[PDB]
Amino acid sequence: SVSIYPSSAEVLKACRNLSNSSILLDKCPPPRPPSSPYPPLPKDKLNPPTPSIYLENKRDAFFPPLHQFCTNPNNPVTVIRGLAGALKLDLGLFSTKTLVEANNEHMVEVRTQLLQPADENWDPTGTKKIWHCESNRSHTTIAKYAQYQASSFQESLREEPFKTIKFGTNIDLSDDKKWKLQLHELTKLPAFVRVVSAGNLLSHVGHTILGMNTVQLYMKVPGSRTPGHQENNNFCSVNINIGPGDCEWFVVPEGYWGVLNDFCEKNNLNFLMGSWWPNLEDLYEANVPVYRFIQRPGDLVWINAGTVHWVQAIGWCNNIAWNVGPLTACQYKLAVERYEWNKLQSVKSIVPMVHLSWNMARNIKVSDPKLFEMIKYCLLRTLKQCQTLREALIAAGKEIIWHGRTKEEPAHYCSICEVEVFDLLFVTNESNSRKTYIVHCQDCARKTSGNLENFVVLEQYKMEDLMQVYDQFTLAPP
Numbered sequence: 001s002v003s004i005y006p007s008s009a010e011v012l013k014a015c016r017n018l019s020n021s022s023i024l025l026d027k028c029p030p031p032r033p034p035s036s037p038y039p040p041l042p043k044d045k046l047n048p049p050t051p052s053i054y055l056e057n058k059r060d061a062f063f064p065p066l067h068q069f070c071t072n073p074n075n076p077v078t079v080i081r082g083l084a085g086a087l088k089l090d091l092g093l094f095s096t097k098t099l100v101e102a103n104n105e106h107m108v109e110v111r112t113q114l115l116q117p118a119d120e121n122w123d124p125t126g127t128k129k130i131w132h133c134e135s136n137r138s139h140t141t142i143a144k145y146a147q148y149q150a151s152s153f154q155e156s157l158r159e160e161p162f163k164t165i166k167f168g169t170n171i172d173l174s175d176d177k178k179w180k181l182q183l184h185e186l187t188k189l190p191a192f193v194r195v196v197s198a199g200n201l202l203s204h205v206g207h208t209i210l211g212m213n214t215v216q217l218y219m220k221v222p223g224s225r226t227p228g229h230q231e232n233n234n235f236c237s238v239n240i241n242i243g244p245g246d247c248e249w250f251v252v253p254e255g256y257w258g259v260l261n262d263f264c265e266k267n268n269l270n271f272l273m274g275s276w277w278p279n280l281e282d283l284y285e286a287n288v289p290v291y292r293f294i295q296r297p298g299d300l301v302w303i304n305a306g307t308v309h310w311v312q313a314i315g316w317c318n319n320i321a322w323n324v325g326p327l328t329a330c331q332y333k334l335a336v337e338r339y340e341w342n343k344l345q346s347v348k349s350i351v352p353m354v355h356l357s358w359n360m361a362r363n364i365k366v367s368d369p370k371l372f373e374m375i376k377y378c379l380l381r382t383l384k385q386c387q388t389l390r391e392a393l394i395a396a397g398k399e400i401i402w403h404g405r406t407k408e409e410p411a412h413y414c415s416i417c418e419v420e421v422f423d424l425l426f427v428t429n430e431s432n433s434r435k436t437y438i439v440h441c442q443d444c445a446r447k448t449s450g451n452l453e454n455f456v457v458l459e460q461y462k463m464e465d466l467m468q469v470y471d472q473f474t475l476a477p478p
């Protein structure tokens, strides 16, 4: 019941300033990748069994402890067995035959890959095992990928230096007028895995983040790989295998992501943006535990926050996937941590955590003190940053044009460095007049116009609005 944060009036008065007391240490320790976790694990604990939920009845899927089992930080992944059958989900709505009938001209992002043996990844000459995973981009239609997927299967039915294969990825199932029956089928899921829910942080973004708060579909042939990654901004993820074939999952706990980052660097690969497939022998030598399991048709895979993982098709199948963000301190903490790390790495945060945090403060009554403090700390830092910049512009006599923002207007990012740009947008005079609105962050704008002569400053939010949202965000009763 104790407020530990200053009021918006106090933050503003603090910004109106050499001799006065501080309100907070604006300096913050910079993000870095963690060392190998303590305590270290012996060899006999490096192949742990996968946390599993065995569903039989529709009632089983709505059992409240399921959500807590999945979000438990000690469980890096949970496989929910029999989920589609328990809910009488019609997986046929996502079959390739149904997709071709529904939208045969829909776009498919093809990844062209080498068919690699089992859990291994070899150089293209088949000489040695390497971490780099060849996966080159092209685009086709559902109709044409479907023909390939079907012909691949017929060819193998004939009983039979790596084969080239094609993985159909990132098929956009967001348009409810093209995918009405498919999307309605997913409303049968329990709330904690649904694409849209009041308890899903990504449902509070206020705009589409494609493939995170909308569904994407994947069409596969054996060997189709999603290489090593953490989810965007460490958000939990949901994956259902449509079948008819199986998928194989490889999972490492979040706490080892620094070790994996180091493995990538040692192999001349970028952890966040590169294409890499771990060598299991390297991980075993370094005492990194690996969860490894098969996802059958109708099985749902829950990837917990920040879990490091990589996946391959064993047979022919489709999968559907999206992300969710539990309303938890752990989820928010890891999303903010990766947001900060992404800035230092100049990697775009697909989830605009500042925009989202302010929407969370508008919409959500937070009753957990630890989560509440994290969100309000973020509001404090960004409110102070905005008012500081605003005063600096006013002090230099730089006009601030009221721009406002429309319904569901997305967060904007810097066209140069790809940082989120919140509230105060820097746009060149030319881009403003032509309404291209190429946003720059402050730092990137100044690098080409130290006094901002070539730029206008557009203001999205009234400062009074932000101050009121901040003051009205208080700890909710349990």
Ligand SMILES: Cn1cc(O)c(=O)cc1C(=O)O
Binding pocket: 218, 225, 226, 237, 239, 309, 310, 311, 312, 319, 320, 321
């Ligand atoms: C579609 N997808 C998305 C992810 O984030 C994965 O980790 C794995 C897949 C897959 O089914 O290969």
Ligand SMILES: [Mn+2]
Binding pocket: 229, 230, 231, 237, 303, 309
């Ligand atoms: Mn994933």
Ligand SMILES: [Zn+2]
Binding pocket: 414, 415, 416, 417, 418, 419, 440, 441, 442, 443, 444, 445
């Ligand atoms: Zn920038």
